Amino acid sequence: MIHKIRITLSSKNVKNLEKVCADLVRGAKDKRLRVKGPVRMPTKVLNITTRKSPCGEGTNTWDRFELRVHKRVIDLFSSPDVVKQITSITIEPGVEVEVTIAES
Amino acid sequence: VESVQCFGRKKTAVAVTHCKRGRGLIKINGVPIELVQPEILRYKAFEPILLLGRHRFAGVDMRIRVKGGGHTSQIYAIRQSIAKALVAFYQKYVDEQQKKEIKDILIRYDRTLLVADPRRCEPKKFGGRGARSRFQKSYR
Amino acid sequence: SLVANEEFQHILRVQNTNVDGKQKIMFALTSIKGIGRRFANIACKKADIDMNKRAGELTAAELDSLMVVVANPRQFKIPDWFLNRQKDYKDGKFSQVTSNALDMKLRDDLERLKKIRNHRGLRHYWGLRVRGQHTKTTGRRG
Amino acid sequence: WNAHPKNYGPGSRTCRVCGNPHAIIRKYGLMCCRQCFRSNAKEIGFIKYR
Amino acid sequence: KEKVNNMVLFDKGTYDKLITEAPKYKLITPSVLSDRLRISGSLARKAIRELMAKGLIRMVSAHASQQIYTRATNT
Amino acid sequence: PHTDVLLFNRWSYDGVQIADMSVEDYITATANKHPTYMPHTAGRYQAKRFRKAQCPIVERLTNSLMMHGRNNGKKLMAVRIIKHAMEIIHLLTDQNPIQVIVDAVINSGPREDATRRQAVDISPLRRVNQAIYLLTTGARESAFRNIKTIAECLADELINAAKGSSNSYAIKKKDEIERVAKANR
Amino acid sequence: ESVTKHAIVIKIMGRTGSRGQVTQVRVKFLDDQNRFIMRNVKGPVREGDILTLLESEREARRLR
Amino acid sequence: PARSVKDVSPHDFVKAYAAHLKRSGKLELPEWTDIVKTGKLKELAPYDPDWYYIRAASMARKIYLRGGIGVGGFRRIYGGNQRNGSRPRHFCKSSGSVARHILQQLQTMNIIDFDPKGGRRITSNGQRDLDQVAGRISAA
RNA sequence: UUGAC
RNA sequence: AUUCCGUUAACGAACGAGACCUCAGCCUGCUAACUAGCUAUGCGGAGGUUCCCUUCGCGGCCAGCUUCUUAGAGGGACUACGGCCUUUUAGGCCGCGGAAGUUUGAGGCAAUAACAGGUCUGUGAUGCCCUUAGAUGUUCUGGGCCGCACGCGCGCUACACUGAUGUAUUCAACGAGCUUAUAGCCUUGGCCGACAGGCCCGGGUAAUCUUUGAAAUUUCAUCGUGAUGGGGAUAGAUCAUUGCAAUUGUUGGUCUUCAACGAGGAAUUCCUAGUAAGCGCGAGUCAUCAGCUCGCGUUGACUACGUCCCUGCCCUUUGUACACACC
RNA sequence: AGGCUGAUAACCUA
Ligand SMILES: [K+]
Ligand SMILES: [K+]
Ligand SMILES: [K+]
Ligand SMILES: [K+]
Ligand SMILES: [K+]
Ligand SMILES: [K+]
Ligand SMILES: [K+]
Ligand SMILES: [Mg+2]
Ligand SMILES: [Mg+2]
Ligand SMILES: [Mg+2]
Ligand SMILES: [Mg+2]
Ligand SMILES: [Mg+2]
Ligand SMILES: [Mg+2]
Ligand SMILES: [Mg+2]
Ligand SMILES: [Mg+2]
Ligand SMILES: [Mg+2]
Ligand SMILES: [Mg+2]
Ligand SMILES: [Mg+2]
Ligand SMILES: [Mg+2]
Ligand SMILES: [Mg+2]
Ligand SMILES: [Zn+2]
């Protein structure tokens, strides 16, 4: 009857990601569901380092470009229909929500 | 369960000593500390025991796990975790005055026995191969 | 340790080469062209020669058994991939060529390429590099 | 006409923005030349911190 | 600069010198014997083992890079 | 005073004395001034001026052995070399190797120099720095392209320097430095 | 003739020399503590530490 | 005390256990023992005549300490720096035939077996054999 | 007068 | 620091500097983790003396917990405190304590006015000019861009014993990874092979799998001052891999060949602490190819704590026949 | 021939 449902959140914006995570945990604590998380995975730092000059003249200066990806994992012990109800709330822009039935 | 778990750090090396009530065992990742490698750094790892004396460790069992860093920095992390674990054990399960005595001995000998070294590797900057070192400059 | 007896020799002669008698036997054989440290070591093992002794301590019979191994590697089960002349151009045979035979083999390789006016043969004839190296800046000795 | 294979090498790949074949950034599947990427870096989401 | 000519095997004269004089040295190492007896370091290493077997010299330090020995009995 | 700390757990700091007023406060080799079990401390001695005078003299010798470039940062080898050298010093001299090391440092430090050129005095700290540099430079030069090992060369350099004999490389250089200084008075 | 003497540094006058490599100091002789002179010193020096003077007759000119 | 593998010096143990494997006469050395090197990173063949037994003893001690190591893992363990003439040194793997042959021999001796998750695992008999040898080493 | 020297 | 205190025919402001933002350093405090662990416990293996002790393996979303790992929120340093020096100043030196007492470290960002500095070969940015079908468009085949008496710049490897070689031993961090087609990416495990490499079963679109993840170093032995087992250029033979294609050697192996070089003239570069140097690793390029670049960690120093001598820079006074500005 | 100089002369080295 009760299953461990895994919700994964990804975003470049920490504040928006943390806001949605709190809305889900707090939205599940209202239904008295058992909640595991949020678990914060290590931040993925995509990095592109490139020559600033469009030509090859001058001092060789470099731009270090970083695109950070933050990932959260929340496990809810409940039925899929109940979880579908909690996650159906409008989510902040740029936060990618992904609901899967944990294979355990 | 009178046990403590204290860590020590040196660069990227982290050693955690699990100190419990026992009979004097001291092992690093299952190996007796008398077999610490390299053998010439064995003196550094034994300084807490040499300074305080084995009779202070007769009533504890220390099991140490160490990860990261390198051969030299792991010894310093282990050396620091042992000293901290014994101090944390005396404070919590023996007495405050005995903790005061041993901590004075450790500090008078070396402050890095209890206080970690904050130094880390400086990042490399473009235009050279080191943090400071620059590429050789030619004019003609 | 041990004292040298009167049989100890300071200079040996193998395949028209001077072999130093004060060298360990494994490294005394490397003075012969075509015999390197890898082949000298395997030759001593197939000849049952103690490699812990100096070349001058070996008897005349022992020194000869080493050259029998070098001359008939396949008989002693030295594999084909271990030889410096594998699948010869003319005969197709596998062998270890040493001393003047090695020098003759190198001469025949270059003469064959030069005779057919092969590009590699021509660059050997002109004294240029043959293995694709840039020549603009290095190898300046003329 | 266009018979030569174009399965690998610089000739097969071009900048997705400008079509130039040089200095392509293939990391993460960007497929942009280094000049176009620097122009569009902020819009793509890359940022300079240090 | 002249080249050293270190013997690779002992002769009767030098071997007897090793058995009589070397036991009296305060410091015995392969390089000490190699220089005093004009023997190669390889021969000196074997010679020190023989002196150890005979009990003429005792060990002070053992390291793959540096070996230190001394006379078994002082003076 | 007395201490239970023994260098390498072999050599006692008791009885070690620095019999020179000028450099006494810049050589750390006595029982009262922070004796150490090993000459390997990940110390931070360059944070401030005159701070390396607290570094043990045996470890200052160990650091100067990490030359040239091929040997940079190989401090475990350097500690071994000094460990072996002190064992050799005890055999040859029948003296405390720590005492011999401080005597070599005291004797090999130049006390006058030329600058600009006229004669000037040398501060006690630079005198210790020069002594350490001269002792390790002589040992390094005699070991290079030689059957003799670095530990044996270091021991002979220290034994001669501690004795004041001119056979030492560091004693000859100190005389040369003080001979030129006198010529430019 | 020159007689070696020991003197203690009293005050640091200031760094001198073309490249600032010298320091001028005021020193008090230990044998006779009522005699003061000025000396040029090479190397790091601070008030209190002792110096060895191969000859004690010379004196350095101020701001030499 | 009662010493096991971890309680004795690894250098002493490998010498003792190598002399134990050779003494049993159960390992069947291949034809190419005297010819091969232990990887392309090497210049010469091993100096020790009994290098095969020494390597087998070393590989048994590592399977005892950690299960799941395969042939590829052992190629890395005995790999090292390869010199490339005038070019910089880089890491190189060691021989797979030497590792595979030794593992297949220790398995017929019933010192190791196939780990279900992959690689090789020490057996109960293997644990006894290694532990008994370590107990007989003289205290040094 | 401002700069540059 | 045009940073401030003050002076003061100026007053009040605007930029730059600072603030700031990112990473690193402290938190046994908060939040909470089966993609991270620890401790305890249960069962099992081995050793020692049935309990007990040591060690290893496995299990438990109902053992417990968050020290270690991860990452959110906060806290923490302000020179706060002491001594002395400075004008009541602004501030400086030394010191306790403290993770930290150089704006704590390192970066990112970064004014006015300029240069006939570089780029039309990054651009479906672009004026004018040239060419436009026996084309300067486009594509295909082949060659060249690498061609070698010589001069120069960045580097790599060395001249050895503080070493090379052969064993034994052993500890990182940043990061990167697939269309599933039999299978195109990173690859574990098994088998075949001396190596190179091949076959098979698989894992991983990833804190889950590769990743159980380096070298220098440590250790024992051999070598023994000999261009030597230092050095590995040049060259012969042969095998395999990438590719439509390897010759002018793509690269990777095996045996053999075994040059200069014994520490470098005038001159000259970089660098003040986890820095220099040494040591390897990832990433970019990439079918194949790293002696390069951008990052990462590991080992870890000497010397200074100054000066304006050299090369330059900033401000003031001053001279000027210079203003294309002392070339 | 190299170095020194933005460059030439002078100067320095081989
Ligand atoms: K050429
Ligand atoms: K290895
Ligand atoms: K058990
Ligand atoms: K443009
Ligand atoms: K145009
Ligand atoms: K481009
Ligand atoms: K070669
Ligand atoms: Mg030969
Ligand atoms: Mg070419
Ligand atoms: Mg925590
Ligand atoms: Mg904070
Ligand atoms: Mg500006
Ligand atoms: Mg122009
Ligand atoms: Mg070109
Ligand atoms: Mg460059
Ligand atoms: Mg070699
Ligand atoms: Mg590891
Ligand atoms: Mg040679
Ligand atoms: Mg190419
Ligand atoms: Mg390039
Ligand atoms: Zn583009």
- DSSP state string for B43-55: HHHHHHHHHH-HH
Q: Is the dihedral of CA A53, A58, A59, A60 positive or negative?
A: positive
Segments forming the whole domain that contains residue G35: 1-64
Distance C129 CA to ligand 7 centre (A): 15
Segments forming the whole domain that contains residue B61: 1-140
Contact criterion met (CB below 8 Å) for C22 and C12: no
Nearest alpha carbon to residue A69 among A17, A4, A5, A25: A17
Query: B31 and H6: CB-CB below 8 Å?
Result: yes
* Count of helix runs (H) and strand runs (E) in chain F: 6, 4
Residue of H nearest to C82 (CA): H35
| H or E element, residue A48 | strand A44-51
Which amino acid is it at F1? P
C114 beta carbon < 7 A from strand J?
no
Contact criterion met (CB below 8 Å) for E7 and E36: no
Distances (CA, A) of A84 to A33, A36, A72, A76, G22: 13, 17, 18, 11, 81
Nearby residues of C104 by Cβ (< 8 Å), 6 or more positions away: none
Eight-state DSSP code of residue G22? E
Nearby residues of G8 by Cβ (< 8 Å), 6 or more positions away: G27, G28, G30, G48, G49, G50, G51
| H or E element, residue G15 | strand G5-16
Q: Residue ranges per domain, chain F?
A: 6-184
| H or E element, residue A35 | strand A34-40
CA distance linking residue B107 with residue C16, whole number of Å: 75
Domain F6-184 sits in CATH at: 1.10.455.10
Any chains having at least 3 CB pairs less than 8 A from chain E are C, F
C71 beta carbon < 7 A from strand J?
no
Distance D10 CA to ligand 6 centre (A): 12
CB < 7 Å to strand J — which of 31-60 in chain B? 37-40
What three-state secondary structure class fits C39?
Answer: helix
Nearest alpha carbon to residue B15 among B55, B44, B50: B44
CA distance linking residue C38 with residue B67, whole number of Å: 41
Q: Which two tokens stand for residue C129?
A: 């590099």
Half-sphere exposure (Cβ direction) of F100: Cα atoms closer than 13 Å: 25
Q: Which two tokens stand for residue C102?
A: 């090695």
What are the b/e assignments for C53-67, b being 16+ CB within 10 Å?
ebbbbbeeebbebbb
Q: Is the dihedral of CA H125, H130, H133, H138 positive or negative?
A: negative
* Token pair 């940022």: residue: D47
Q: What is the DSSP string of C71-115?
A: H-GGGGT--GGG-SB-S-TTT---B---HHHHHHHHHHHHHHHHH
Triad F30, F35, F36: Cα angle to 5°: 145
Determine the distance between F120 (CA) and K14 (C1') in angstroms.
39
Triad H95, H97, H101: Cα angle to 5°: 130
Distances (CA, A) of D15 to A89, B30, D12, D40, E11: 40, 57, 11, 13, 81
B140 beta carbon < 7 A from strand K?
yes
Eight-state DSSP code of residue B25? -
Say whether residue D26 is in contact with chain A using an 8 A CB cutoff. no
C119 beta carbon < 7 A from strand J?
yes
Q: What part of C 99-128 touches E (C-beta under 8 Å)?
A: none
Nearby residues of A76 by Cβ (< 8 Å), 6 or more positions away: A4, A5, A7, A28, A33, A34, A35, A36, A83, A86
Q: Which stretches does DSSP call E strand in G21-60?
A: 22-29, 36-42, 50-53
CB < 7 Å to strand J — which of 43-72 in chain H? 43-48, 51, 54-55, 58, 61-62, 66-72
Binding site for Mg(2+), residues of C?
30, 32, 35, 132
Q: Which two tokens stand for residue C76?
A: 């002693």
Say whether residue B105 is in contact with chain F using an 8 A CB cutoff. no
- CB-based burial of residue A82 (10 Å sphere; 0-12 exposed, 13-18 middle, 19+ buried)? middle
> How big, in percent rounded to 5, are the helix, strand and coil portions of chain B?
40, 20, 35
Contact criterion met (CB below 8 Å) for F167 and F94: no
* J269 C1': nearest CA residue: B136
* Token pair 């046990």: residue: B3
CA distance linking residue C14 with residue C97, whole number of Å: 14
Looking at the structure of chain D, the number of domains it has is: 1
Determine the distance between F51 (CA) and J260 (C1') in angstroms.
48
Contact criterion met (CB below 8 Å) for E44 and E34: yes
Radius of gyration from C-alpha coordinates of chain B: 19
Q: Where are the alpha helices (DSSP H) in chain B?
A: 42-52, 54-57, 71-93, 96-109
Distance B135 CA to ligand 15 centre (A): 6
State the distance between the two ends of chain F, measured CA to CA, in whole angstroms.
43
| H or E element, residue H75 | helix H71-77
G11 beta carbon < 7 A from strand J?
no
Which amino acid is it at F52? K
Eight-state DSSP code of residue F25? G
Contact criterion met (CB below 8 Å) for E14 and E37: yes
Which amino acid is it at C77? K
> Which residue of F118, F120, F124 is in closest CB contact with G50?
F124
CA distance linking residue D23 with residue G41, whole number of Å: 60
Give bridge partners of residue H122 from the DSSP assignment: H112
H26 beta carbon < 7 A from strand J?
no
Q: Where are the alpha helices (DSSP H) in A1-104?
A: 14-29, 80-87
Query: A65 and D27: CB-CB below 8 Å?
Result: no
Within 8 A of D38 by CB-CB distance, chain A residues are 50, 52, 54, 63
Q: Residue ranges per domain, chain A?
A: 1-104
Say whether residue C82 is in contact with chain H using an 8 A CB cutoff. yes
Residue of F nearest to B108 (CA): F34
Other CB atoms within 10 A of residue H2 CB? 7
Nearest alpha carbon to residue F128 among F54, F17, F53, F62: F53
What three-state secondary structure class fits C124?
Answer: helix
Distances (CA, A) of F133 to B9, C128, F105: 33, 50, 10
Within 8 A of C37 by CB-CB distance, chain H residues are 43-44
Within 8 A of B126 by CB-CB distance, chain A residues are 60-62
CA distance linking residue F184 with residue F178, whole number of Å: 10
Contact criterion met (CB below 8 Å) for B88 and B19: yes
Looking at the structure of chain G, the number of domains it has is: 1
> Which residue of F91, F149, F151 is in closest CB contact with E26?
F91
Looking at the structure of chain B, the number of domains it has is: 1
Q: Where are the alpha helices (DSSP H) in F15-123?
A: 57-64, 75-93, 97-108
Q: Which long-range contacts (CB under 8 A, 24 or more apart) does A50-53 make?
A: A50/D25, A50/D34, A50/D37, A50/D38, A51/D34, A52/D38
